Each structure stands twice: as C-alpha cells, then as structure tokens.
Amino acid sequence: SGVEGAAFQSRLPHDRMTSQEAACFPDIISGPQQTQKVFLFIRNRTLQLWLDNPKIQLTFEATLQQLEAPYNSDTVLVHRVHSYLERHGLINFGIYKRIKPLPTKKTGKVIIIGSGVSGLAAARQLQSFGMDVTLLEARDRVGGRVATFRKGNYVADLGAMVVTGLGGNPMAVVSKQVNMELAKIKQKCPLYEANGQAVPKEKDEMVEQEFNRLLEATSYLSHQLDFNVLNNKPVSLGQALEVVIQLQEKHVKDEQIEHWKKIVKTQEELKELLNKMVNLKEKIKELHQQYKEASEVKPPRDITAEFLVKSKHRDLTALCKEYDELAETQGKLEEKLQELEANPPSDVYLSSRDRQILDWHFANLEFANATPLSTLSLKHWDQDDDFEFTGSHLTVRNGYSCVPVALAEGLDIKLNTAVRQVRYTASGCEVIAVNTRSTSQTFIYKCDAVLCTLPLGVLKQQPPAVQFVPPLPEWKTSAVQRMGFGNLNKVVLCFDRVFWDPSVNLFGHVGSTTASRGELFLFWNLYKAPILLALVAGEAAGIMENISDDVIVGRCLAILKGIFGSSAVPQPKETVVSRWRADPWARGSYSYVAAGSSGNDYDLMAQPITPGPSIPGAPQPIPRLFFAGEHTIRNYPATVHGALLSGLREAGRIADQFLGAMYTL
Amino acid sequence: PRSFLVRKP
Amino acid sequence: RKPPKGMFLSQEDVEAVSANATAATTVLRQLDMELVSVKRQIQNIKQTNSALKEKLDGGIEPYRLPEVIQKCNARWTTEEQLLAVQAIRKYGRDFQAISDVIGNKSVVQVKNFFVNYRRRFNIDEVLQEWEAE
Numbered sequence: 187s188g189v190e191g192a193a194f195q196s197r198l199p200h201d202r203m204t205s206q207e208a209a210c211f212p213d214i215i216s217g218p219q220q221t222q223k224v225f226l227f228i229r230n231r232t233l234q235l236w237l238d239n240p241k242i243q244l245t246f247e248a249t250l251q252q253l254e255a256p257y258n259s260d261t262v263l264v265h266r267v268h269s270y271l272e273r274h275g276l277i278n279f280g281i282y283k284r285i286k287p288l289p290t291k292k293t294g295k296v297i298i299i300g301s302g303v304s305g306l307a308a309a310r311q312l313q314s315f316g317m318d319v320t321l322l323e324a325r326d327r328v329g330g331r332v333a334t335f336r337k338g339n340y341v342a343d344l345g346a347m348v349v350t351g352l353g354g355n356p357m358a359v360v361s362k363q364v365n366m367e368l369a370k371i372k373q374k375c376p377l378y379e380a381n382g383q384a385v386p387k388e389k390d391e392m393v394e395q396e397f398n399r400l401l402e403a404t405s406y407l408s409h410q411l412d413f414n415v416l417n418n419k420p421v422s423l424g425q426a427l428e429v430v431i432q433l434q435e436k437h438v439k440d441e442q443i444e445h446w447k448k449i450v451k452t453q454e455e456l457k458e459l460l461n462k463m464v465n466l467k468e469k470i471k472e473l474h475q476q477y478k479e480a481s482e483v484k485p486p487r488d489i490t491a492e493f494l495v496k497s498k499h500r501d502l503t504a505l506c507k508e509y510d511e512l513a514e515t516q517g518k519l520e521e522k523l524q525e526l527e528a529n530p531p532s533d534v535y536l537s538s539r540d541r542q543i544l545d546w547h548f549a550n551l552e553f554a555n556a557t558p559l560s561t562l563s564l565k566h567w568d569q570d571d572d573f574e575f576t577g578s579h580l581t582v583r584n585g586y587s588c589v590p591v592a593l594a595e596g597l598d599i600k601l602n603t604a605v606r607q608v609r610y611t612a613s614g615c616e617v618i619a620v621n622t623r624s625t626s627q628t629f630i631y632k633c634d635a636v637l638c639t640l641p642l643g644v645l646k647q648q649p650p651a652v653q654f655v656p657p658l659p660e661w662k663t664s665a666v667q668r669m670g671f672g673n674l675n676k677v678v679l680c681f682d683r684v685f686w687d688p689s690v691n692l693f694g695h696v697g698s699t700t701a702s703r704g705e706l707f708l709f710w711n712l713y714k715a716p717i718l719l720a721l722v723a724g725e726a727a728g729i730m731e732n733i734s735d736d737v738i739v740g741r742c743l744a745i746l747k748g749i750f751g752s753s754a755v756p757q758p759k760e761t762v763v764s765r766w767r768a769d770p771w772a773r774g775s776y777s778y779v780a781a782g783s784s785g786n787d788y789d790l791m792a793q794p795i796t797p798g799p800s801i802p803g804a805p806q807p808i809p810r811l812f813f814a815g816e817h818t819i820r821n822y823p824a825t826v827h828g829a830l831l832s833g834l835r836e837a838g839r840i841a842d843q844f845l846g847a848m849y850t851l
Numbered sequence: 852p853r854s855f856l857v858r859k860p
Numbered sequence: 861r862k863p864p865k866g867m868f869l870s871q872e873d874v875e876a877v878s879a880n881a882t883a884a885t886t887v888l889r890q891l892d893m894e895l896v897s898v899k900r901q902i903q904n905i906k907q908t909n910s911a912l913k914e915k916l917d918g919g920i921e922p923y924r925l926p927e928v929i930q931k932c933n934a935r936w937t938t939e940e941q942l943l944a945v946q947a948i949r950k951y952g953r954d955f956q957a958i959s960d961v962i963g964n965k966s967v968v969q970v971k972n973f974f975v976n977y978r979r980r981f982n983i984d985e986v987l988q989e990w991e992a993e
C-alpha cells in the first residue's frame with residue numbers, strides 16, 4: 187500500500203520504468219537515476235489518486251494541485267506523465283463523472299466491430315479522446331461472451347462468471363464504478379463418485395495431491411528434460427501426462443521386481459544352507475552308529491580300540507558343533523524372510539477407482555483451458571501464470587451482464603448488424619454489414635480506422651464469415667490457424683428450493699469413463715435464488731452440443747438424485763443450455779495455447795495492419811486495421827479483464843496514431 | 852487458462 | 861532441478877517409452893511377465909525348501925553326546941602318550957583335536973609334547989605319514 191500499492195494494483199513495477207514508458211519518455215530513462223525516481227513517483231502518485239477515487243475524472247490540474255515539492259516543481263513532467271496515463275487507460279477508464287463536459291466537435295472516425303467487453307472498453311476511450319466512434323454488433327444485445335440469463339428472480343451467467351481475484355485486476359476499479367454484487371467463492375469442493383457417495387477424505391486428498399504432483403512432473407519434462415517434440419509433432423499436455431503416468435506405473439513394477447528379486451536371493455541362500463544341513467545330519471547319523479558300535483566292544487580293550495571310541499567321540503562333537511552354527515544361520519535367514527515378505531512395496535500405481543477420480547481432476551483442467559488436454563501446448567499452456575491476480579475469486583451475484591450494459595451507456599451501438607466485409611486502403615476503410623433480421627438489407631461504413639474485436643472462433647471460420655479486402659497477410663492468418671479456440675458449456679437449473687448444502691458453492695461429480703470425464707463433472711451454487719449450474723467440459727463439451735436440452739437436463743437430475751436422494755430433487759422450473767461452439771458469433775468459448783503455438787502468437791494477433799499505398803511510389807501509409815480481444819492479450823488471455831485491457835490498449839494506440847502524441851517530447 | 856482451475860493448492 | 865518427490869523420470873526412461881507407438885505397453889509387459897516368472901520361481905524354491913526342512917525334522921537330538929567335564933592334568937600316563945601318538949597319525953598338527961581326543965591335556969601341553977617326545981615317538985616319521993594322505 188501507499189503509492190507502491192497503486193503501481194501494483196495497476197500491473198506495474200513500482201520502482202522500475204516499463205518498456206512502454208521508455209518508449210514515450212526516452213529522455214528520462216536514458217538520463218540520471220535521480221529524475222527516474224521523480225518520474226516513477228509522479229506516475230505512482232497519480233495512480234493512487236485515480237484509484238482512491240475512480241468515480242470521477244482525474245485532471246492535470248487536480249493532479250498538480252495534490253503534488254508536493256520537489257515533485258510539483260516541474261510541470262511539463264507532471265503534464266506528460268498525466269497525459270500518458272490518461273492515453274493508455276491507466277487513469278480515467280470505465281465509467282466516471284467527467285468534470286470538463288465533452289469537447290464540442292470530434293476528430294477522426296472509427297468503426298468498431300463487436301460490442302464485447304473489448305469493443306465497449308475501447309469505444310469509451312476513443313469517445314473520451316473525442317473521436318467519432320460507432321460499434322457494429324451482430325447480436326441483439328451487448329457483451330457478447332459475457333452472457334447472463336434472466337427470468338423472474340432467476341439470474342445466471344452462461345458466459346464469464348468469475349472475477350479471478352481483485353489484486354491488480356482492472357475489474358476491481360470497474361466494480362467501484364458499477365454495482366456488481368461481488369460474492370466470495372468458498373474453496374471447498376466435495377466429489378461424488380458414480381454411485382452417489384462421497385469420495386472419502388483419505389482418497390480425496392491422495393488423488394488430488396497426485397494430480398498436482400503429475401502437473402509439476404510435466405513441467406519438469408518440459409523445461410529440464412526438454413521433451414517437447416515427438417516425431418516432429420509438438421508434444422501436448424495430454425501426451426505428457428500419459429508419458430508421466432506410464433513412467434509411474436513402470437516404476438511401481440520395477441520396485442516389485444527388485445523386491446521379489448531379494449526374496450529369491452535369500453530364499454536361495456537358504457536352499458544351499460539346508461542342503462549343507464541335510465548332508466550333515468547325514469554324516470552325523472552314520473557317525474553315531476560308528477561310535478555306538480565302538481562302545482559295544484566291552485572292556486578291557488587295547489589302546490587302538492580305546493582311541494577309536496575316543497576319536498569317533500571328538501569327530502562327532504565337532505560335526506555337532508557345525509550343525510549347530512548352521513541352525514543359527516538358518517534362524518537368521520528364516521526370519522529375515524518374514525522381514526521382506528511382510529512389508530511389500532506398492533501393489534499398483536492407481537486403482538480403477540483412483541484413476542477415475544484423477545479423471546475428474548483432468549476434467550477440472552480441461553474446463554480451465556476450455557479444451558481436451560491433448561490439444562494444449564506442453565511448453566506454453568500456462569504461459570500466462572506470472573500475471574495471476576491475488577485474492578479470492580468472486581462471482582457476480584447480480585449477473586455479469588450488468589457490466590457490458592453499464593459500459594454501453596452513451597455509445598453509438600448498432601445492434602443486429604453483421605459485418606460481412608472489411609475493406610481498408612491507404613485513404614481509409616469501409617465496413618460492409620447487413621441486418622441479421624432481413625439479411626439483404628445492406629449497410630456501408632466509411633472510416634479512418636477499423637478496430638476488429640471478432641472472436642478468434644469467428645476469425646477462424648472456413649469458409650470465412652468476414653472477408654478482408656485485401657486479405658490479411660499470411661503472418662496474421664498463420665497466427666489465427668495456430669492458436670487454439672476452445673469450448674466449454676453450462677447447464678442452468680432453476681429450482682423452487684435449496685436441496686443442497688447451502689454453505690457449499692461447488693461440488694464435483696465423478697464420471698464412469700475417461701471418455702466422459704467432462705460431462706456434468708461440476709456444479710455451482712452461487713446465486714441468491716435456488717439455481718444450480720453444471721459445467722460440460724473437455725471432449726464432452728462438443729459432443730453434448732448435438733444433444734437435446736431435455737436429455738441433458740435428464741442426466742443432470744439423474745446425477746443430482748444419486749448425490750442427494752431420489753426425492754429431495756424436484757422437477758426444475760426453468761432450464762437453459764449454452765452451445766458456444768455452434769453460436770455463430772462466438773464459434774467457441776475462449777482461447778487456449780494450442781500445441782504448436784505459444785504466447786507470442788497472441789502478440790502477432792494484436793499487431794495492426796497497414797495497407798499498401800494507392801498510387802505506387804507514394805509514401806508509406808498510416809496503419810488502418812486494428813485488433814483487440816481476449817485472443818490478443820498475451821498476459822491475460824481468455825478472460826474479461828483481459829479483453830477489457832486489450833480494448834484500452836488499442837484505444838490508446840489508435841488515438842496516438844490519429845490525434846497525435848503531444849506527450850512524447 | 853490455469854487461473855480458472857477449481858480447488859487451487 | 862529435480863522431479864517432485866516420489867515422481868520418477870530419467871532422461872533414459874522417457875526415451876524408452878516414447879521410441880514408438882506401443883513401446884509403452886510393450887515395456888510394461890516385459891515387466892508384467894518378468895514379475896509372474898520371478899513369482900513362480902519363488903514358489904518353486906519355497907516348495908523345495910519346505911521338503912528339505914521335513915527331512916531335518918527332529919534335529920540331531922538322538923545323536924548328541926553328553927557333556928564330559930574333566931580336569932586338566934600335567935602327567936602323561938602311558939595310556940595318554942599312546943592316545944596322543946595315534947591322535948597325531950590321524951590329525952597332523954590340529955592341536956585342538958588332539959587335546960580333545962586325549963581328554964585331559966590342554967592345547968599347549970599338547971604342543972610341548974611335540975617337542976618333549978619328538979625323538980622317542982618318531983613324531984617326524986609320524987607327521988610325514990599324516991601328510992601322505
């Protein structure tokens with residue numbers, strides 16, 4: 187906390203200048219360490235100010251007003267720093283009360299495809315910088331993949347659902363600006379096998395712990411062992427998990443082998459000893475007869491006859507010495523074998539029941555990545571890890587849509603308008619859209635720049651749902667192809683009554699087969715109403731899309747009965763089922779790092795497109811086609827705050843281009 | 852991505 | 861730097877379970893069989909050793925010779941000298957044996973005897989005849 191808290195809650199190192207800061211302040215960062223601290227302080231302090239009160243615009247005046255000497259002594263610096271921050275949506279983004287009502291006439295004109303959060307976020311900024319902004323949206327509502335089901339008092343999201351921690355999350359600021367009811371999610375998650383019975387704490391804990399052990403293992407294969415290509419194909423996470431489980435099975439056997447191999451080594455030292463013992467009890471038997479016969483010769487006897495008795499006597503006790511030392515040895519081994527035979531190593535690596543619960547953990551992962559682990563990149567699936575927010579995940583109790591809708595306020599949004607063609611050239615762009623309702627009723631939009639926020643599922647369609655004229659450069663279309671666009675679905679169950687443990691937010695269900703680990707594997711209790719929400723992940727996700735709503739809600743009830751009793755589970759009053767892969771304005775749910783891709787492709791996605799010149803030999807043009815969206819933010823893919831940020835990013839980059847960058851001197 | 856995982860350690 | 865604790869993953873073993881499509885299940889069968897083999901081997905030698913034990917039943921109890929507890933003397937009765945000469949012919953230099961056969965002489969007296977009578981009991985001749993066997 188302090189000014190350093192701000193830096194952090196703004197995703198920036200508090201005592202270092204960033205790459206994007208060096209870009210606009212090369213004079214400072216290439217200069218003396220003393221000025222850098224002033225910069226960093228002015229930056230951090232302005233942030234704090236904006237953050238402490240994100241409901242009202244923060245102006246250059248108000249900023250200098252609240253600064254101290256020696257910091258408020260140089261006012262060009264303060265002005266640059268403040269201008270920079272404003273431009274890149276670090277201060278004054280979202281929904282604030284503007285002090286200086288909007289500058290009367292606008293400069294430049296931007297068409298924005300899609301009113302997802304990335305669109306909306308960018309739109310607002312552009313408008314704030316005084317540009318002419320218009321959004322084209324194919325749907326009859328805003329918010330795209332932030333969808334929210336409403337009916338009566340029932341409220342459930344079919345899209346984004348969780349705020350993944352406020353620590354550094356832009357959505358932290360947005361929630362102070364907008365009434366979202368933010369409820370903590372309690373970490374506890376009971377599983378329930380196919381039969382209907384809790385997996386017991388002993389197992390529950392030892393399968394999980396193996397799961398986590400198994401992830402770390404794959405990471406070790408990747409980074410330390412370099413196991414990343416396999417017959418030219420790049421290795422997936424799925425493959426790697428198999429290769430690790432195999433090597434764990436192999437070693438389980440490897441152990442058994444050398445354990446029994448120790449029994450035969452010892453059970454066979456025994457054999458050789460008993461052979462020696464049977465052969466001694468033999469010579470003893472016979473030597474006794476001899477000595478017996480020598481004592482039958484009654485006295486008086488001569489000396490050799492006396493010697494004989496005496497000799498055979500010694501000879502016999504000597505051989506009774508040995509067969510006594512051997513019974514000693516025999517006694518050692520004989521027990522050193524009840525040793526080994528009593529503490530056997532592990533029977534199996536994981537049983538069928540075990541392996542089935544591990545599958546639910548993999549379902550968890552296939553849900554988190556919205557895809558079959560066989561599609562994820564081993565090296566990179568978790569490349570976005572360092573940037574995780576801190577603090578408890580939350581849900582939006584009043585429904586997530588509440589946020590798009592808030593942001594859409596004051597904006598030129600054309601709903602039911604499906605872009606079909608984007609035409610960009612050295613002098614400008616036209617966008618050709620149609621009316622989704624009567625699809626021959628055509629529209630044309632002329633602008634300085636297009637911000638494209640099409641979902642990557644959309645950008646992938648073959649054959650194309652949107653045509654680029656001219657076609658996008660191969661570097662971009664290869665990024666589109668390489669990248670992964672997964673799928674994940676929701677079933678909403680609306681009841682007259684809570685029949686579940688009200689103090690539990692989520693409870694798993696374990697499938698029967700690997701093939702179906704995804705199917706209704708998880709259930710959420712989040713809302714004020716009695717709604718229950720069930721995920722359909724992994725391979726199951728895509729196959730369940732081709733199945734009727736009834737059948738789905740069937741298997742849902744089935745499972746719940748199993749867990750709760752065949753008559754605590756009423757008929758559901760209202761039910762909904764998401765089908766994201768089939769939804770033509772999404773074509774999927776969110777992106778993942780596919781095998782063969784990397785985080786760098788996300789950067790390729792965000793790079794703007796610059797047309798060739800009109801008259802050949804004319805100067806290099808301005809860039810015209812820009813990109814935002816969840817698939818374009820390397821450090822925050824697949825999320826709301828991620829899209830939001832990418833929106834801010836482009837808004838800045840467009841304004842720098844068309845309204846010019848006064849602050850860089 | 853990872854952060855969406857239920858039951859984090 | 862190293863695997864998690866209790867996970868096992870050697871560079872070598874990874875390469876072996878990857879070198880083709882079913883080098884996985886192959887390797888896990890050579891071991892599933894190597895096991896079955898060693899397991900029946902155990903039972904066989906358990907069976908062998910069980911029948912070798914039944915032959916040792918009773919120990920050597922009907923063959924033990926009661927403990928003779930006699931006091932070490934210093935005089936060589938003519939009887940004892942004669943026992944000795946024979947003990948030599950049949951035990952060479954094993955002074956412990958000789959001392960036991962005679963009964964009432966210690967390993968050292970027995971040693972001394974070798975020197976004291978060497979001439980009179982041609983112990984040279986005797987000892988060389990224990991060698992020719």
Ligand SMILES: Cc1cc2nc3c(=O)[nH]c(=O)nc-3n(C[C@H](O)[C@H](O)[C@H](O)COP(=O)(O)OP(=O)(O)OC[C@H]3O[C@@H](n4cnc5c(N)ncnc54)[C@H](O)[C@@H]3O)c2cc1C
Pocket residue numbers: 299300301302303304305322323324325328329330331332344345346347348349350603604605606639640641644651652674675676766770771772774775776814815816817823824825826827828829
């Ligand atoms: C099931 C599910 C659960 C999720 N849960 C979370 C979560 O818990 N937490 C989290 O942070 N994120 C979550 N996400 C992801 C998050 O929803 C998205 O990354 C984010 O909302 C994407 O916003 P966007 O602006 O990039 O794309 P979108 O919101 O899809 O915006 C694209 C817009 O373009 C429109 N469009 C498409 N084609 C055309 C065209 N032809 N012409 C005009 N308009 C067009 C679409 O209708 C849409 O409005 C989840 C996603 C899914 C699918």
